[PDB]
C-alpha cells in the first residue's frame, strides 16, 4: 500500500535517467540492466527519505 506508488516512481525515475545517460554518454553503457537496478534501489531508499519531510514533528 505505502509502497504501491513508491515502486512506480522509482521505476519511472530509473528508466528516464538511464535513457538520458545512454543518449548523452561518450561511452556505451554496458549492462544497463545492472545500472538501472542500482538506480532503482537507490531511488527507492531516497524516495522513502523524501516522503518523510512531510510531518516529522
Amino acid at each position, epitope marked *: 500500500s505505502m509502497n504501491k506508488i513508491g515502486d512506480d516512481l522509482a521505476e519511472t525515475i530509473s528508466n528516464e535517467l538511464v535513457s538520458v545517460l545512454q*543518449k*548523452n*554518454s*561518450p561511452t*556505451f*553503457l*554496458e549492462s*544497463s540492466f545492472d545500472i538501472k537496478s542500482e538506480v532503482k534501489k537507490h531511488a527507492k531508499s531516497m524516495l522513502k527519505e523524501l516522503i518523510k519531510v512531510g510531518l516529522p514533528s
Partner: antibody
Amino acid sequence: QVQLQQSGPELVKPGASVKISCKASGYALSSSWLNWVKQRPGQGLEWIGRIFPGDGDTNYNGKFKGKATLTADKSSSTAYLQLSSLTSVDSAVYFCARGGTVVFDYWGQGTTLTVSS
Amino acid sequence: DIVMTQSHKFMSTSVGDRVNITCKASQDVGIAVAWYQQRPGQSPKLLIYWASKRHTGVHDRFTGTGSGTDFTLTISTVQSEDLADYFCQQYSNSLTFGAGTTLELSR
C-alpha cells in the same frame, strides 16, 4: 556473440553515390550511437557522423556534412551511410562502430570504396 | 581544429620488453583520450578510454597514462599479438585521431 556486419566493397565513378549498410546484433541499437569513420590509404583516421537510431538524431563533421547523410531502420537493426559527390579523395575503408558519442567500444569490419573513372 | 600527432611512425621493441607509444596534442584535451589497436587486415579495437581506463577485456599489460597535451600507452610485456598499429584520439570538444604508430620487431 556481438558483431556488426557491413555491406561489401563498392566501385563508383566520380560524381556518383553509394549506400553502405551496417547491421547490428548482440545489442540494441535503440540504446546506442552508431558512428562512421574514414580510414584512408595514408592511414589517417577521420570521423564522419553518428546517429542515435532510437530517436534518429544525427551529428556530422563540418567536413562531410555537405555530402554524407545517415539514416537507420530500427526494425532491421541496420544503419545506412550514404555518400554523394564521390571522388578519389573519398576512396577509403569505411568502418561503422558501436559506442556512445565518442568512445568506439566495438568496430565492424569495414567497407572498401574505390572511386575511379 | 585540435591536432593529435604521433611523433614516431614506428617504435622498435621485442617480445618480453616494455614499450611506450606516445601521442602529442596541440591543445589541452584534458583526459579525453582513447587508444586503439589495429592489426593488419583487421578493424580497430579499443584499449584505453579517458586516457587511463581499460576497456572490458583489456589485459593488464595495457597501462595507459596521461592528461593534457602529452599521453602514453605503456605495454608492460610485448607479445606477438601486440605487433600492430596504434592510434590515439581526443574528444575534449571535438574528435581528432592521430595518424598512428606502428610497432615493429627490433633486429
